[PDB]
DNA sequence: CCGACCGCGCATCAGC
DNA sequence: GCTGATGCGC
DNA sequence: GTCGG
C-alpha cells in the first residue's frame, strides 16, 4: 500500500473493462500493471517513472500523471456515476453472474438486490445460490476460521481413506491473514495419471463432507473439481457463522507438486509463471511442464518432485508461497 | 503498425 | 450422444 | 492496453 492509490485505481480499471466493457485483455493488461507497480519498491512520483516497467504503457503512464496531480482519476469518477455499470458491476459480485448475464439482467431492467429475489426465475441454480449466500460470500474468512474449517476437512478425509491427502492452498497456503475462500488440493494413490482406478475418490469425500453437515451446497462437482459452499459449526446460542464458499481439486497424485503450484497461485502469480516458461521454452499446467515444439504441440511431461523442481527449468529461483500474492 | 495475450474444469447450448 | 463454442469459474 | 513480430 506503498503505491496502492496506483494499484487500486488500476484494478478498479481493470475490473470495468471485464465486467462491463467484457474486453477481457484489457482487464489483463491493468492487472499486470497494478502487480507490477505493487511489487515495485518506491512510491511513485510520475507516470513516465512508471513506465519503465514493463505492463505500463503510455496511457497507464498519463493517468498515473493525473491520479497523483489530483488524487483522482476523471474516468473513474464518470464510471461510479453511471447507475448502469454500477448496476452491471454490482450483479458480477454475485456468485454465478458473469458479465454476459450481468448485463443481460440490467437490460431487461434488474438492477438491484431486490429485482434478483422477485426473479429467482430468471437465475440457474448456482446464481441462486450466489444469491441465497450473497452477503455471506462478501466477507472474508479469518485465518482462524480457515484453521478450524481446515481441521474438519483433514479430520473428515482421514476418515474415508487413511491414504487421501489434503492440501489447503489458494490465500490460506500463501500465508493471508484472511482468506476469500477455502481451495482443497485432493491426492488419493488411485488417482495416477495412469488409471483412475478406483474412480469416485472425489465424489466420496464430497459426501462425506456432505454428512457432517459441513457441505451446505452444491454449485458444480464433476470427477475432479468440486465447486460448492460450507460452514463452520457454532455452538448453541453464537450467531451462526457465514457460509463459505469451498473449492476441492482432485489432482492424479504423480503430479501432485504442479498442482500445489497451480492451486497455491495468486492467479496473478500463475500467469506471470507460465508467460516466463514459454519464453523458456516449456509450457506449465496444474498436472505437467514440457518442452515446447516449434509444431505448437508440447513435448513430454518431465520429472518434478518439488515445487522447485518447476522453478528451476524456467530458472527462477525458489519463491516461498508467501512470496506469490502479485 | 496490427494481432497476441496462462491454462483448464464444469455447465450449457448449438450443430450435428 | 458428440464436438466445439461460450459463459463462469479455479 | 501494452508489447512485439
Ligand atoms: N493459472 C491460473 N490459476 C488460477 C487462476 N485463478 C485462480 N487460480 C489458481 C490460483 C489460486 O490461488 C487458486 C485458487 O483461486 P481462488 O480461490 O479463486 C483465489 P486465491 O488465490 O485463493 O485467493 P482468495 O480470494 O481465495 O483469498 O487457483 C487463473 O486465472 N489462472
Ligand atoms: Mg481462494
Ligand atoms: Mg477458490
Ligand atoms: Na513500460
Ligand atoms: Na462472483
Redesign the pocket.
Known amino acids: 500500500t506503498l503505491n496502492g492509490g496506483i494499484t487500486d485505481m488500476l484494478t478498479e480499471?481493470a475490473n470495468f473493462?471485464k465486467n462491463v466493457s467484457?474486453?477481457i485483455?484489457?482487464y489483463?493488461?491493468?492487472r499486470?500493471?497494478a502487480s507490477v507497480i505493487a511489487k515495485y519498491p518506491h512510491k511513485i512520483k510520475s507516470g513516465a517513472e512508471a513506465?519503465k516497467?514493463?505492463?505500463?504503457?503510455?496511457?497507464?503512464?498519463?493517468?498515473i500523471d493525473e491520479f497523483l496531480a489530483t488524487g483522482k482519476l476523471r474516468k473513474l469518477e464518470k464510471i461510479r456515476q453511471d447507475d448502469t455499470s454500477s448496476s452491471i458491476n454490482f450483479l458480477?459480485?454475485?456468485?454465478?453472474?458473469?458479465?454476459?448475464?450481468?448485463?443481460?439482467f440490467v437490460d431487461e431492467g434488474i438492477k438491484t438486490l431486490e429485482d434478483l429475489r422477485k426473479n429467482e426465475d430468471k437465475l440457474?441454480?448456482?446464481?441462486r445460490i450466489?444469491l441465497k449466500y450473497f452477503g455471506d460470500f462478501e466477507k472474508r474468512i479469518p485465518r482462524e476460521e480457515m484453521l478450524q474449517m481446515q481441521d474438519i476437512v483433514l479430520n473428515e478425509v482421514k476418515k474415508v481413506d487413511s491414504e487421501y491427502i489434503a492440501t489447503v492452498c489458494?490465500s490460506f497456503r500463501r500465508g493471508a491473514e484472511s482468506s476469500?475462500?477455502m481451495?482443497v488440493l485432493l491426492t488419493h494413490p488411485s488417482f495416477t495419471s495412469e488409471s483412475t482406478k478406483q474412480p469416485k475418490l472425489?465424489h466420496q469425500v464430497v459426501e462425506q463432507l456432505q454428512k457432517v453437515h459441513f457441505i451446505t451446497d452444491?454449485?458444480?462437482?464433476?470427477?475432479?473439481?468440486?465447486?460448492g459452499v460450507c460452514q463452520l459449526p457454532s455452538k448453541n446460542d453464537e450467531k451462526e457463522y457465514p457460509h463459505r464458499?469451498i473449492?476441492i481439486?482432485?489432482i492424479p497424485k504423480d503430479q501432485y507438486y504442479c498442482g500445489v503450484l497451480?492451486?497455491t497461485?495468486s492467479?496473478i502469480f500463475?500467469?506471470?509463471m507460465?508467460?516466463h516458461?514459454?519464453e523458456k521454452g516449456?509450457?506449465?499446467?496444474?498436472?505437467?511442464i514440457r518442452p515446447?515444439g516449434v509444431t505448437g504441440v508440447?513435448g513430454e511431461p518431465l520429472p518434478v518432485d518439488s515445487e522447485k523442481d518447476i522453478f528451476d527449468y524456467i530458472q527462477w529461483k525458489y519463491r516461498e508461497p508467501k512470496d506469490r500474492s502479485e
Open positions: 480499471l473493462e467484457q474486453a485483455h484489457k489483463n493488461a491493468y499486470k500493471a513506465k516497467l514493463p505492463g505500463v504503457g503510455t496511457k497507464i503512464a498519463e493517468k458480477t459480485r454475485v456468485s454465478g453472474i458473469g458479465p454476459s448475464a450481468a448485463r443481460k440457474n441454480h448456482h446464481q450466489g489458494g476469500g475462500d481451495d472425489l452444491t454449485l458444480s462437482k464433476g470427477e475432479t473439481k468440486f465447486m464458499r473449492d481439486r482432485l497451480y492451486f497461485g492467479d500463475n500467469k506471470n507460465r508467460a516458461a514459454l516449456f509450457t506449465i499446467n496444474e498436472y505437467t515446447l508440447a
